[PDB]
């Protein structure tokens, strides 16, 4: 039987996604489940099946504790001083040997455990490999655009997910196109696809500029703020700590060429490079531009800003659902 175990551990399909010690622990867990299904009672068994060459030599766990419930895995602290245990937990002794690791039900449960383990393997591997590209934009065709979320093929058995809440009624989907974003959260302890990528976050566009805008990335300029009402308005507020560059003149390109390109990349969303100031007053003055404001007031105890607008430029002051204001408050 040991020869078959060695053949199995050697001829695994994914030698890179399922490392050798992982095969060892998977076989150990499978044999543990087999031995559990063997006896009528509930007794957990560790295997440690001679990792390199030899066969199995099982054990018997006993869980040192003053309890008695399920006495198969019970050893009281007072009645444990023999065998030189002397401890309070970890009495995994070799009281049990002579397991059968090949019969029908054992082989079936071992195949099932192996499937679960290779799935867990693939998951952890793809997640902790493609998680390095969390701040930078990822590429890849979609697996399937379901209702609650969409799943995207990032490459060799590589998968990501984009949630439904971050989607748009006008943003448009079917298996086979590639939609990008920013990997915003990774939950490696989940039960399935755990590579969560969003598209509505502001820093997205910032990262986007880091691919196109050469002024950003070298710290010579400073992209500070990004007000993003997805589908409505995506404005950016940058700052220049140097003394030979313009905040809006350089990053705009040549009469709406690079900003228009990244707008079409973001979905044709209206993008206006705004210039924030060191004070919130001029900041909200510029965020609601081009328009006039009859009153700018700041309130700290209320955590609010009163912006009263004059009449004459309403068509540029409110817009749709107060979008020109909705970014500022956001």
């Amino acid at each position: 039987m040991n020869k078959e175990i060695l053949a199995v551990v050697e001829a695994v399909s994914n030698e890179k996604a399922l490392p050798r010690e992982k095969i060892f622990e998977a076989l150990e867990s499978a044999l543990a489940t087999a031995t559990k299904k063997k006896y009528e009672q509930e007794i957990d068994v560790r295997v440690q099946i001679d990792r390199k060459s030899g066969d199995f030599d099982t054990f018997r766990r006993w869980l040192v504790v003053d309890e008695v419930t399920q006495p198969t895995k019970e050893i009281t602290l007072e009645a444990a001083r023999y065998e030189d245990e002397s401890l309070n937990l970890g009495d995994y002794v070799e009281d049990q040997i002579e397991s059968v690791t090949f019969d029908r039900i054992t082989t079936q449960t071992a195949k099932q455990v192996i499937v679960q383990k290779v799935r867990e393997a693939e998951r952890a591997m793809v997640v902790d490999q493609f998680r390095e590209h969390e701040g930078e934009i990822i590429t890849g065709v979609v697996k399937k655009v379901n209702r609650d979320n969409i799943s995207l093929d990032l490459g060799n058995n590589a998968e990501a997910v984009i949630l439904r809440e971050d989607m748009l009624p006008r943003e448009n989907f079917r298996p086979g196109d590639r939609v990008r974003g920013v990997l915003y959260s990774v939950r490696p302890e989940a039960r399935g696809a755990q590579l969560f990528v969003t598209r509505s976050k502001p820093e997205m566009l910032i990262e986007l500029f880091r691919i196109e805008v050469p002024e950003i990335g070298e710290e010579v300029i400073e992209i500070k703020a990004a007000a993003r009402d997805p589908g409505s308005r995506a404005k950016i507020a940058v700052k220049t700590n140097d003394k030979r560059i313009d905040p809006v003149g350089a990053c705009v390109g040549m009469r709406g060429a690079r900003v228009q390109a990244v707008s079409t990349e973001l979905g044709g969303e209206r993008i206006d490079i705004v210039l924030w100031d060191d004070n919130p007053a001029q900041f909200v003055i510029n965020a609601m531009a081009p328009a006039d404001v009859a009153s700018i007031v700041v309130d700290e105890d209320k955590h609010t800003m009163d912006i009263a607008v004059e009449a004459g430029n309403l068509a540029q002051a409110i817009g749709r659902n107060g979008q020109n204001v909705r970014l500022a408050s956001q």
């Binding site: 065709v141 490459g155 060799n156 448009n172 086979g176 196109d177 079409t264 044709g268």
Partner: protein, 417 residues
């Protein structure tokens, strides 16, 4: 309406046009069926439709005309052609066809061809009186390809080095031997820019097999040429499909008296795809390789030649080494004595950030006397004799450092004396 017009449009413009037509939301689905549905509408109300592409013959007798922007893929964009055309104009695998199309009628989903307007940019009458490909009389390299632009920028010098390391001409077989992380990508990029700038008359094609989509995207919009590629998220079927289609297109085009030059990177990945797509014939080599799995890659590489009757076909395929597998070495050893233009890129120089890392001592070109004049080739011989006793890194150091100040290659030859 032309198909290539909607082809060169981005997806956003197709979405805007579909919304201007007032239909069901088209932005939801593939660019493929996006173009399909907008064409169906505009052809329900519109002129004769026009289209263009490359033809592939099916085992049913009919043929499919596909686009290179979709890298010759199957989909609703394809144009159905009947075997009656393949009897009348005797169509062939890889013919560049452009003609009139119509919507498919009841029960059909593929646009039907009406009348061939241009076959391989040429007359159908003149499409009969043509010469067969292997029936041609191959020859050595007769006309040399000028890669030196004469401006001497930061990257152009790279091409200049080639002009003194291994001269290339129409009909020559180029094979690049380089380990990973050696700078071959922008090497081919600079070469393609130079040969597209110096020779806008010869149709230039590149091939990327199992490449990352980032390089594919940045290449398909920076150089001239039908930049066709094959990303690794598809099986070997698609890769061998691109191989077939573009090699047949190049074959037909040189048969039409045109100089075609094919850029492949890399030949080892394409050969691996060939191996994993070809059925096993019983004979295994070291590393799971079939003996028959190299037959079609050898055909693909040897298709290039210099025709006496007219036109030429030059292939430049790159090979990978030093990456650990068995297949890489067996393939590179099988392909070593095949190409007549070796270009060796040693990683030992690239590790020192000396670009381009070119093994000048282990590189060369056979029959190089038919590309340069007597004094040019003599200066090449004298410089090879000068630089050969030197090592590898110091050799490229001296080469690049002395080509940095002088700006034309013949001036470099003069100053080297």
């Amino acid at each position: 309406m032309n198909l290539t017009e909607l082809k060169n449009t981005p997806v956003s413009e197709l979405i805007t046009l579909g919304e201007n037509m007032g239909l069901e939301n088209l932005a939801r689905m593939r660019k493929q069926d996006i173009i399909f549905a907008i064409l169906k509408q505009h052809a329900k109300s519109g002129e004769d439709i026009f289209g263009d592409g490359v033809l592939e013959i099916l085992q049913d007798g009919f043929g499919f005309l596909r686009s290179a922007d979709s890298s010759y893929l199957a989909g609703p964009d394809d144009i159905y052609v009947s075997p009656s055309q393949i009897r009348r104009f005797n169509l062939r695998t890889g013919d560049t066809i452009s003609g009139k199309i119509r919507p498919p009628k009841e029960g059909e989903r593929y646009f039907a061809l009406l009348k061939v307007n241009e076959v391989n940019f040429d007359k159908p009458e003149n499409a009969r009186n043509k010469i067969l490909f292997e029936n041609l009389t191959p020859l050595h390299a007769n006309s040399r390809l000028r890669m030196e632009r004469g401006n001497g920028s930061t990257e152009d010098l790279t091409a200049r080095v080639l002009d003194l390391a291994s001269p290339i001409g129409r009909g020559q077989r180029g094979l690049i031997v380089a380990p990973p992380k050696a700078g071959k990508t922008m090497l081919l990029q600079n070469i393609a820019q130079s040969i597209a700038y110096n020779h806008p008359d010869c149709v230039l094609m590149v091939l990327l097999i199992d490449e990352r989509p980032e390089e594919v995207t940045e290449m398909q919009r920076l150089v001239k040429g039908e930049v066709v590629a094959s990303t690794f998220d598809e099986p070997a079927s698609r890769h061998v499909q691109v191989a077939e289609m573009v090699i047949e297109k190049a074959k037909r085009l040189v048969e039409h008296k045109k100089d075609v030059i094919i850029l492949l990177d890399s030949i080892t990945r394409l050969a691996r795809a060939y191996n994993t797509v070809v059925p096993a014939s019983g004979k295994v080599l070291t590393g799971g390789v079939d003996a028959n799995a190299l037959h079609r890659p050898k055909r693909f590489f040897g298709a290039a030649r210099n025709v006496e009757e007219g036109g030429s076909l030059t292939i430049i395929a790159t090979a990978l080494i030093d990456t650990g597998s068995k297949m890489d070495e067996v393939i590179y050893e099988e392909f070593k004595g095949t190409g007549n233009m070796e270009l060796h890129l040693s990683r030992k120089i690239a590790e020192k950030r000396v670009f381009p890392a070119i093994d000048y001592n282990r590189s060369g070109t056979r029959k190089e006397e038919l590309l340069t004049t007597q004094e040019e080739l003599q200066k090449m011989w004298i410089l090879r004799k000068i630089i050969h006793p030197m090592g590898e890194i110091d050799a490229m150091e001296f080469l690049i450092n002395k080509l940095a100040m002088t700006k034309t290659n013949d001036d470099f030859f003069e100053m080297m004396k």
